[PDB]
């Protein structure tokens, strides 16, 4: 049941790996 139960963790890394790039851009000192 709940196939997202995992995807959630997946989207976690990616996002956790993307934000690190976004934040830099959306940092807007």
UniProtKB/Swiss-Prot annotation:
Effect recorded for residue 24 to L: Reduces copper(1+) uptake. Reduces copper(1+) uptake. Reduces copper(1+) uptake
Superkingdom of origin: Eukaryota
Effect of residue 9 to A: Decreases of about 40% the copper(1+) transport activity
Transmembrane segments: 3-23
Extracellular side: 24-26
Function: Mobilizes copper(1+) out of the endosomal compartment, making copper(1+) available for export out of the cells.
Record's protein name: Truncated CTR1 form
Species this chain originates from: Homo sapiens (Human)
Classification of source organism: Eukaryota, Metazoa, Chordata, Craniata, Vertebrata
